[PDB]
Design a binder for this molecule. Structure first.
Ligand SMILES: NC(=O)C1=CN([C@@H]2O[C@H](COP(=O)(O)OP(=O)(O)OC[C@H]3O[C@@H](n4cnc5c(N)ncnc54)[C@H](OP(=O)(O)O)[C@@H]3O)[C@@H](O)[C@H]2O)C=CC1
Ligand SMILES: CCCc1nc(N)nc(N)c1C#CCc1cc(OC)ccc1OC
Ligand SMILES: [Mg+2]
Ligand SMILES: [Mg+2]
Length: 225
């Protein structure tokens, strides 16, 4: 019942997301977007969840974690159960899938979660293609002068485009009401792909905030008792 949204910043065209356990760039405006989108809710009485892999957790600066004003869940196969409170603001789960089921119980969650954001792991994103209802993808491009950063972790673009379509026309409507974005909706060709969304420039990069949504599904079967 609660929307599950993967959120990620990726450098085109390979959609690289990381290098040696860290981000390949440092972009304050992209950081600001991530913070505001994952924090803010339309309903003042709710929070969002942010679910992450152990390795992503370990890579967030210690002064900045857990991420304020959001329910943090860290997943590790060495943890004890599906969803366990370990400290203020911090849950542990030994299962991405079972933690989502647990978070979705109206009984457990009192309908006071607005959205569940999956905020990474490369490994976590790989497993999320079949779990996410949408993706918020910041598509990053080095400006002509700009050296492409080295990268070793990538979003599965093939799986993305199999399952989801570019719904960035609806990005503004989709984001929490009180967020304010600088750009206007723009469509630009870049190395032979259409890049559509809300543009920003910072340091060596231009980037677009985009929204991907699940493609329509045929009706093959509905479970009957
Ligand atoms: N650009 C962006 O928008 C973002 C980029 N990143 C980047 O991604 C990289 C980190 O990604 P990656 O190395 O893949 O690691 P992840 O952050 O995806 O963490 C992987 C770990 O999560 C645990 N795990 C994986 N699947 C499950 C599951 N189904 N249930 C329970 N636990 C599970 C395992 O922990 P364990 O080994 O303890 O069992 C595994 O080693 C970094 O470079 C980081 O900078 C991260 C977030 C955002
Ligand atoms: C700094 C926002 C980037 C970001 N951007 C987008 N579009 N999606 C995301 N999921 C993240 C993310 C993340 C997790 C993260 C947070 C962080 O400080 C808060 C430091 C390192 C991080 O991962 C290595
Ligand atoms: Mg535990
Ligand atoms: Mg699992």
């Amino acid at each position: 019942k609660v929307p599950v949204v993967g959120i990620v910043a990726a450098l085109l065209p390979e959609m690289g997301i990381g290098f040696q356990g860290n981000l390949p760039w440092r972009l304050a405006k992209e950081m600001k977007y991530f913070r505001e989108v994952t924090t803010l809710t339309n309903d003042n009485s709710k929070q969002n969840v942010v679910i992450m892999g152990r390795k992503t957790w370990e890579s967030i600066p210690q002064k900045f974690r857990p991420l304020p004003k959001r329910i943090n869940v860290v997943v590790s196969r060495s943890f004890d159960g599906e969803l366990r409170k370990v400290e203020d603001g911090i849950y542990h789960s030994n299962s991405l899938r079972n933690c989502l089921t647990a978070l979705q119980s109206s009984l457990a969650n009192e309908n006071k979660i607005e959205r569940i954001y999956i905020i990474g792991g490369g490994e976590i994103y790989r497993q999320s293609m079949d779990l996410a209802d949408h993706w918020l993808i910041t598509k990053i491009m080095p400006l002509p002068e700009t050296t492409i950063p080295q990268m070793d972790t990538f979003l599965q673009k093939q799986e993305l485009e199999q399952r989801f379509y570019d719904n960035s026309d609806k990005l503004v409507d989709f984001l929490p009401s009180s967020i304010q974005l600088e750009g206007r909706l723009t469509s630009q060709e870049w190395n032979g792909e259409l890049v559509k969304g809300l543009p920003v420039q910072e340091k060596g990069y231009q980037f677009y905030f985009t929204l991907y949504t699940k493609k329509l599904e045929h009706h093959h079967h509905h479970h009957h008792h």
